[PDB]
Design a protein around this ligand. Structure first.
Ligand SMILES: CN(C)CCCN1c2ccccc2Sc2ccc(Cl)cc21
Ligand SMILES: [Ca+2]
Ligand SMILES: [Ca+2]
Ligand SMILES: [Ca+2]
Length: 180
């Protein structure tokens, strides 16, 4: 019964996250309000994003986030996955946050961010806003991303490793700023 919070789950969570046992039990109550039976599917996750961005279509972005939350790739976000992601994004140190962002941009999980993956995240963000925006010629989404990508791509091989992305993002936080 996915609804019941087991002690074994709490034990791993207090080891792996910055939440106390009392905080985890309180979060489990709120989690059950949005997800009474304890498992959030991708459609369920898209549905919550749609409510929050009524003038856009956040489906593409929500699906990208969902796959990073769903660490075991079983098609549902369990409470333990929710708490782990919340710990990283709301309490984690800068290296932990940037690793999470790297996983979001690395759509195919091959260990590299390509320009095309970065374009795709940006396009998804624009869709969520609800705008495929007309831009001046030098301000196109591709042009903006390309200049930031080029500065992070220190060996100019058209892909970003975790280290290129993380150190580059410390000098220029815009790619991860856009995620929030
Ligand atoms: C205000 N709230 C909806 C929580 C914040 C938004 N958001 C989110 C959505 C639904 C369930 C959990 C989360 S945590 C989170 C972590 C990373 C990113 Cl990129 C987004 C989110
Ligand atoms: Ca899962
Ligand atoms: Ca990739
Ligand atoms: Ca590179």
């Amino acid at each position: 019964k996915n609804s019941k919070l087991k002690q074994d789950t709490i034990d791993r969570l207090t080891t792996d996250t910055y939440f106390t046992e009392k905080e985890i039990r309180q979060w489990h109550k709120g989690f059950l309000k949005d997800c009474p039976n304890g498992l959030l599917t991708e459609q369920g996750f898209i549905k919550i994003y749609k409510q929050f961005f009524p003038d856009g279509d956040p489906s593409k972005f929500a699906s990208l986030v969902f796959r990073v939350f769903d660490e075991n790739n079983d098609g549902a976000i369990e409470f333990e996955e929710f708490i782990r992601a919340l710990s990283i994004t709301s309490r984690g140190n800068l290296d932990e946050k940037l690793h999470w962002a790297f996983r979001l941009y690395d759509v195919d999980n091959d260990g590299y961010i390509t320009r095309e993956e970065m374009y795709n995240i940006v396009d998804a963000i624009y869709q969520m806003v609800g705008q495929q925006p007309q831009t001046e010629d030098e301000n196109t989404p591709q042009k903006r991303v390309d200049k930031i990508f080029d500065q992070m791509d220190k060996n100019h091989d058209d892909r970003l490793t975790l280290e290129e992305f993380r150190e580059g993002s410390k000098a220029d936080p815009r790619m991860v700023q856009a995620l929030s």
